[PDB]
């Protein structure tokens, strides 16, 4: 199951709306929970959540000490849409002691902002250079290390410093040849169309996430005609795109431009009523 973007605040009630999601098509904001205690998060888990297409934001969630039980299999943050150029935001998470996103293999676009988390350790142990390309634009300041010593114990080492997420979880490292594709527990590369992980090697129907596009249970390089690229991660048909446009006619009224199903016509284009096709403006745009 693919779920839309979600903002969960005040109390954990609405969080169970994530129980069947394996992909969040949009962002995931979990914030402003002041009366939440660790007790509340004991048996709370979302093992199905594999991927976020936009960003993950966590702000002022009291009692949450780690993300290792909440999102144990979150493998990819696609970063299609970012929160001020960041795909991952951990801000003023007052009781967070570790990140623990031990399955996070790739942040496809955008940077990481981890700030003002006074109990947060296990950050120095994370080699982000294996998750992001744009590590230079990360902003990881004012955490427990900036004001104290973290007893970070862990395993792979890189320049030499050992890499881990928690006291009991190393950082997964695949052979250089495997690139971003992922690899099996035996070290065998996943198919060239996979991203982060897979259940079996050299099979694009055995991926956990796609390097490019998802179609019909497979990781494809491109959405072929008659399909359209949607949310920069999956292939959809004309009908799906049309039904989104009319569902919002009663939020965005979706259009067709350059083999994509997009929320709005680009600069200098207007929608030719009927076929959803973006046509260039004769003079100004209405």
């Amino acid at each position, epitope marked *: 199951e693919v779920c839309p973007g979600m903002d969960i605040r005040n109390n954990l009630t609405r969080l169970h709306e994530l129980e069947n999601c394996s992909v969040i098509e949009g962002h995931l904001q979990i914030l402003l929970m002041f009366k939440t205690r660790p007790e509340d998060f004991r048996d709370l888990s979302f093992p199905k959540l594999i991927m976020i297409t936009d960003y993950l934001l966590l702000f002022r969630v009291y009692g949450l000490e780690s993300l290792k039980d909440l999102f144990p299999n979150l493998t990819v943050i696609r970063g299609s849409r970012l929160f001020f150029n960041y795909a991952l935001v951990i801000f003023e998470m007052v009781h967070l002691k570790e990140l623990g996103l031990y399955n996070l293999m790739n942040i496809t676009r955008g940077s990481v902002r981890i700030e003002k988390n006074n109990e947060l350790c296990y950050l120095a142990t994370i080699d982000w250079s294996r998750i992001l390309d744009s590590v230079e634009d990360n902003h990881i300041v004012l955490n427990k290390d900036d004001n104290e010593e973290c007893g970070d114990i862990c395993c792979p080492a890189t320049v030499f410093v050992e890499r881990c997420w928690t006291h009991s979880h190393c950082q997964k490292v695949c052979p250089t040849i495997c690139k971003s594709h992922g690899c099996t527990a035996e070290g065998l590369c996943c198919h060239s*169309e996979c991203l982060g992980n897979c259940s079996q090697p050299d099979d*694009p*129907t055995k991926c956990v996430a796609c390097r490019n*596009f998802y*179609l*019909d*249970g*497979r990781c*494809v*390089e*491109t*959405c*072929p*005609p*008659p*399909y359209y*690229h949607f949310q920069d991660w999956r*292939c959809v048909n004309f009908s799906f795109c049309q039904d989104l446009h009319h569902k919002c006619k009663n939020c965005h009224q979706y259009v067709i431009h*350059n*083999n*994509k199903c997009i929320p709005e016509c680009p600069s200098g284009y207007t929608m030719n009523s009927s076929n959803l096709l973006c046509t260039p403006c004769l003079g100004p745009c209405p």
Partner: antibody
Amino acid sequence: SQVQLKESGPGLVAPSQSLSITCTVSGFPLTAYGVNWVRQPPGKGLEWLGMIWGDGNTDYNSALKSRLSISKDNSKSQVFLKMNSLQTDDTARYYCARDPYGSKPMDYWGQGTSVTVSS
Amino acid sequence: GSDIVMSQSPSSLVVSVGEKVTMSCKSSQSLLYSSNQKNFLAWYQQKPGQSPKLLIYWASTRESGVPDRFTGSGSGTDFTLTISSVKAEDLAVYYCQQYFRYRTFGGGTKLEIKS
């Protein structure tokens, strides 16, 4: 594990009749891959008949559309061809081939099945 | 709209072992996809009494196993297949195929080898 496709056909068909071929596939899901029907008359070139997408949608050769019918049964790993009102020009070897659509063109082919339209 | 037409030239070629071979393919419409800037064009090789074998896809990408002597080139509507040093095993019919919208095979170029 081995990707393979096998056609079953009539051998011999009388003119004005219908032809029925079954492609039984193995080693990949029919839900994620397309299957084409390509025929080849003796001594002549390859002619594409039609395709059946993972989602069950079908595309046909516009010149033959009126007489063609492709369907499948994912559970039985079978794709079916039905071509009506056969004439002697329909005498050909009929192949089924996997379509890794979005990534590759027809990669794995069956050994084909010879169909002779005779009076 | 209307169905894509594929043309191949020459219809037949006779060459000696060790010579270069060039065969052409023409498309009624551009096969260049604006999304990835790749051409939806493939080359197949059919040896006598065997089913067709994929050589090249995306106009120039070699299929796994295909020798480096086989070289696909071209963009839009005009495409070629080149065999740098033709071997005796290269006796086959070579077909180009468009896979942009539906599929269309070209007439084929019969490659014959001189003794």
